[PDB]
Amino acid sequence: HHHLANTSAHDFSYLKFVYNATDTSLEGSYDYIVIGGGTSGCPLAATLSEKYKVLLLERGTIATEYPNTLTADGFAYNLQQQDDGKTPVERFVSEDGIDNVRARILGGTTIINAGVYARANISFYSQTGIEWDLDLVNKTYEWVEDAIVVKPNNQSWQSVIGEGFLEAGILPDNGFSLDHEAGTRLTGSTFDNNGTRHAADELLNKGDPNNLLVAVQASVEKILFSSNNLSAIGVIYTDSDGNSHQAFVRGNGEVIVSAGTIGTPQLLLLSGVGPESYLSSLNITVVQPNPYVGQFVYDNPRNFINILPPNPIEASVVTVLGIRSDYYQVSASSLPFSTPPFSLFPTTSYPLPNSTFAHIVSQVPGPLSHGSVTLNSSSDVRIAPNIKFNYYSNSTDLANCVSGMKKLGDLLRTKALEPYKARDVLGIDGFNYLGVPLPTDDASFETFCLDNVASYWHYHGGSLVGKVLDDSFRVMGIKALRVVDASTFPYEPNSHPQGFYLMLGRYVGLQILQERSI
Numbered sequence: 001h002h003h004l005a006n007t008s009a010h011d012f013s014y015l016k017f018v019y020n021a022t023d024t025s026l027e028g029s030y031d032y033i034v035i036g037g038g039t040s041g042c043p044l045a046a047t048l049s050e051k052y053k054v055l056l057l058e059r060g061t062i063a064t065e066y067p068n069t070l071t072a073d074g075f076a077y078n079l080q081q082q083d084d085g086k087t088p089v090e091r092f093v094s095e096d097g098i099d100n101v102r103a104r105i106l107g108g109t110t111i112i113n114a115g116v117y118a119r120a121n122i123s124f125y126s127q128t129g130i131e132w133d134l135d136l137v138n139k140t141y142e143w144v145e146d147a148i149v150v151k152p153n154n155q156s157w158q159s160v161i162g163e164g165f166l167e168a169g170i171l172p173d174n175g176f177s178l179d180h181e182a183g184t185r186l187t188g189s190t191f192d193n194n195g196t197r198h199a200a201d202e203l204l205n206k207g208d209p210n211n212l213l214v215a216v217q218a219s220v221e222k223i224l225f226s227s228n229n230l231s232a233i234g235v236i237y238t239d240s241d242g243n244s245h246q247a248f249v250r251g252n253g254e255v256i257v258s259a260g261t262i263g264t265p266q267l268l269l270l271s272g273v274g275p276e277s278y279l280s281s282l283n284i285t286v287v288q289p290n291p292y293v294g295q296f297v298y299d300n301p302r303n304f305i306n307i308l309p310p311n312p313i314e315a316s317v318v319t320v321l322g323i324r325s326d327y328y329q330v331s332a333s334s335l336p337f338s339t340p341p342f343s344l345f346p347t348t349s350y351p352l353p354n355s356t357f358a359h360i361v362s363q364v365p366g367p368l369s370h371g372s373v374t375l376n377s378s379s380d381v382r383i384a385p386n387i388k389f390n391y392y393s394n395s396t397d398l399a400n401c402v403s404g405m406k407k408l409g410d411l412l413r414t415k416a417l418e419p420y421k422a423r424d425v426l427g428i429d430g431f432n433y434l435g436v437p438l439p440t441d442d443a444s445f446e447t448f449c450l451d452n453v454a455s456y457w458h459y460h461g462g463s464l465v466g467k468v469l470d471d472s473f474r475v476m477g478i479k480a481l482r483v484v485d486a487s488t489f490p491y492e493p494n495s496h497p498q499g500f501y502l503m504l505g506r507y508v509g510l511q512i513l514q515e516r517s518i
């Protein structure tokens with residue numbers, strides 16, 4: 001593991017080429033425009049800037065404006081904070097009724113997330129059928145890991161949960177490993193051992209400062225196309241005062257959408273790329289009919305129990321993973337709170353913890369259930385789109401939640417967890433629970449799964465490879481337009497996908513530079 005980061009301050013050196021979108025001198029022609037300074041978009045823009053003039057457009061501001069985004073201790077704060085339209089956490093509620101959040105900040109969701117770092121399941125590449133350069137994938141993981149990933153230090157709760165997973169039969173013991181494999185392991189973290197958050201914005205430090213420009217509070221409202229050989233030629237973006245701006249690509253350059261599972265389909269639909277009948281019904285002029293834009297949108301379920309130990313436990317960031325094919329498990333330990341972190345629990349109606357608690361969680365893989373992103377406003381990109389995930393519409397997802405919940409049952413029965421019981425009785429009713437405890441034939445587990453579901457926050461889809469994009473991430477039917485972010489794949493690459501999407505930004509950047517090379 002030569003290729004890991006050190007403890008270090010968050011590196012804001014890149015702010016020397018970050019400008020307010022109010023600056024009209026950013027307007028003009030570039031080789032590349034990247035829309036969304038997020039998980040994929042930052043390493044993509046940094047990579048393209050090695051050879052070419054790049055403009056990165058981000059709707060949010062810089063992370064220095066919200067200091068609680070820069071520490072492990074700050075994780076809860078950013079979710080607890082009210083969404084005033086400027087904050088790094090944007091709140092939404094799916095049409096299923098499940099509270100959720102997305103990032104609105106330079107560095108994207110890597111600035112607000114739970115820090116867990118893993119490489120994709122090595123079977124994922126062949127499952128996609130894309131002709132990946134697998135050696136280049138691994139070099140690109142090392143380039144990310146060298147910059148922002150550490151081997152975490154021991155945390156007492158994470159060690160308890162790892163011992164519990166192993167005693168519950170989540171085998172083998174993989175020790176410390178970044179790989180998504182069956183068994184129990186310590187994985188990597190983008191929080192360093194001093195609790196400093198590292199993130200995708202720091203990969204902008206790898207860019208060429210003579211070639212890369214970043215516009216913040218740049219809300220990209222439309223992709224501009226050639227008038228006739230249909231090509232993307234540029235974007236309209238507005239600034240924080242509401243004034244409009246244009247930027248263009250030139251020659252053999254390209255526009256890449258990296259606006260996330262929610263923002264990419266939304267901007268494609270606003271730009272007339274999407275289902276012909278849907279867009280016609282909104283009187284949006286169709287530039288490229290595609291029945292799949294904003295279709296196949298997925299949210300992996302989170303199901304959980306909360307235990308209240310009779311003695312305090314130390315708060316922790318998640319580093320210890322229990323992985324099976326059919327469920328991915330972790331646990332966080334938290335301080336109590338009287339303001340809830342929005343979307344931790346699926347509604348605002350959830351009881352508040354009075355003392356320290358362990359949130360013990362299982363994630364459904366895939367998932368197979370899907371829904372869609374549709375426009376709320378046919379013109380205004382600042383109005384969030386409608387999103388529906390149809391949680392547990394697919395019975396296989398429900399079957400996998402039942403298996404995961406039975407395994408959390410096994411975990412609550414381990415010697416590892418016994419000291420955290422309020423009563424030394426034989427049964428798991430010896431724990432004190434915040435909210436609904438586990439119910440042991442299948443009907444009661446099914447009800448528990450359905451009624452107590454939350455977002456894992458690892459939503460993906462809406463612009464899938466094989467539906468909207470080709471195997472090179474190009475929008476089918478349009479020259480000079482790509483999509484690179486979590487909108488691109490219908491199944492998770494692993495339990496914790498930020499690692500894959502950080503890698504993907506640079507990887508596709510290297511594919512574009514190779515395609516263009518002589």
Ligand SMILES: Cc1cc2nc3c(=O)[nH]c(=O)nc-3n(C[C@H](O)[C@H](O)[C@H](O)COP(=O)(O)OP(=O)(O)OC[C@H]3O[C@@H](n4cnc5c(N)ncnc54)[C@H](O)[C@@H]3O)c2cc1C
Pocket residue numbers: 035036037038039040041057058059060101102103104105106107108109110112113114115116117118218219220221258259260261263264267381456457458459484485486487495496497498499501
């Ligand atoms: C609370 C939370 C915790 C998570 N924890 C983890 C975890 O610990 N580990 C893990 O592996 N994964 C985790 N995830 C998931 C993972 O972080 C995300 O799936 C991944 O970061 C998504 O990357 P992306 O590039 O698709 O989107 P983002 O990183 O969200 O990037 C999209 C960017 O585009 C910008 N944007 C959107 N629309 C526009 C527009 N029109 N114009 C301009 N800019 C625009 C956004 O502001 C944003 O910065 C978590 C997610 C959340 C929400």
Ligand SMILES: *[C@@H]1O[C@H](CO)[C@@H](O[C@@H]2O[C@H](CO)[C@@H](O)[C@H](O)[C@H]2NC(C)=O)[C@H](O)[C@H]1NC(C)=O
Pocket residue numbers: 121122123124127180181182323324325326
């Ligand atoms: C890693 O990804 C693979 C491929 O998607 C997962 O799928 C397994 O592989 C076989 C064929 O490759 C399939 O029949 C099953 O869906 C999976 N196998 C089993 C035994 O269930 C695999 O499960 C993923 N691994 C983990 C640990 O998540």
Ligand SMILES: *[C@@H]1O[C@H](CO)[C@@H](O)[C@H](O)[C@H]1NC(C)=O
Pocket residue numbers: 007008009194195196
């Ligand atoms: C250790 O973390 C502290 C917490 O704020 C911070 O002051 C410092 O940057 C870290 N140490 C370093 C960078 O060596």
Ligand SMILES: *[C@@H]1O[C@H](CO)[C@@H](O)[C@H](O)[C@H]1NC(C)=O
Pocket residue numbers: 020021022061062216217240241
């Ligand atoms: C951009 O400029 C405006 C003033 O025109 C200001 O209100 C806003 O905060 C600035 N944004 C950033 C990110 O500096």
Ligand SMILES: *[C@@H]1O[C@H](CO)[C@@H](O)[C@H](O)[C@H]1NC(C)=O
Pocket residue numbers: 119122134135138179
């Ligand atoms: C890439 O790295 C993984 C571990 O993450 C290893 O299993 C795999 O063999 C590597 N593949 C190649 C092509 O080197």
Ligand SMILES: *[C@@H]1O[C@H](CO)[C@@H](O)[C@H](O)[C@H]1NC(C)=O
Pocket residue numbers: 226227228229230
């Ligand atoms: C526009 O479309 C025509 C098809 O009539 C195509 O041949 C041409 O390459 C395009 N030209 C420009 C300037 O966009």
Ligand SMILES: *[C@@H]1O[C@H](CO)[C@@H](O)[C@H](O)[C@H]1NC(C)=O
Pocket residue numbers: 281282283
């Ligand atoms: C679309 O425009 C036509 C006028 O051409 C109008 O009849 C129809 O109601 C419009 N629909 C919407 C949804 O704006």
Ligand SMILES: *[C@@H]1O[C@H](CO)[C@@H](O)[C@H](O)[C@H]1NC(C)=O
Pocket residue numbers: 375376377386
């Ligand atoms: C927009 O969202 C609101 C409130 O979030 C929703 O209830 C309304 O029906 C939506 N409108 C459209 C046209 O989708």
Ligand SMILES: *[C@@H]1O[C@H](CO)[C@@H](O)[C@H](O)[C@H]1NC(C)=O
Pocket residue numbers: 368369393394395396
């Ligand atoms: C669940 O998902 C699969 C797609 O993998 C589909 O074939 C299957 O028919 C779906 N089942 C239900 C109950 O819809």
Ligand SMILES: CC1(C)OCc2cc(C=O)ccc2O1
Pocket residue numbers: 075076114318330331332333334335341344359361
């Ligand atoms: C596994 C998961 C979702 O990770 C993050 C997390 C954070 C808190 C902080 O209050 C609490 C619980 C929690 O659980």
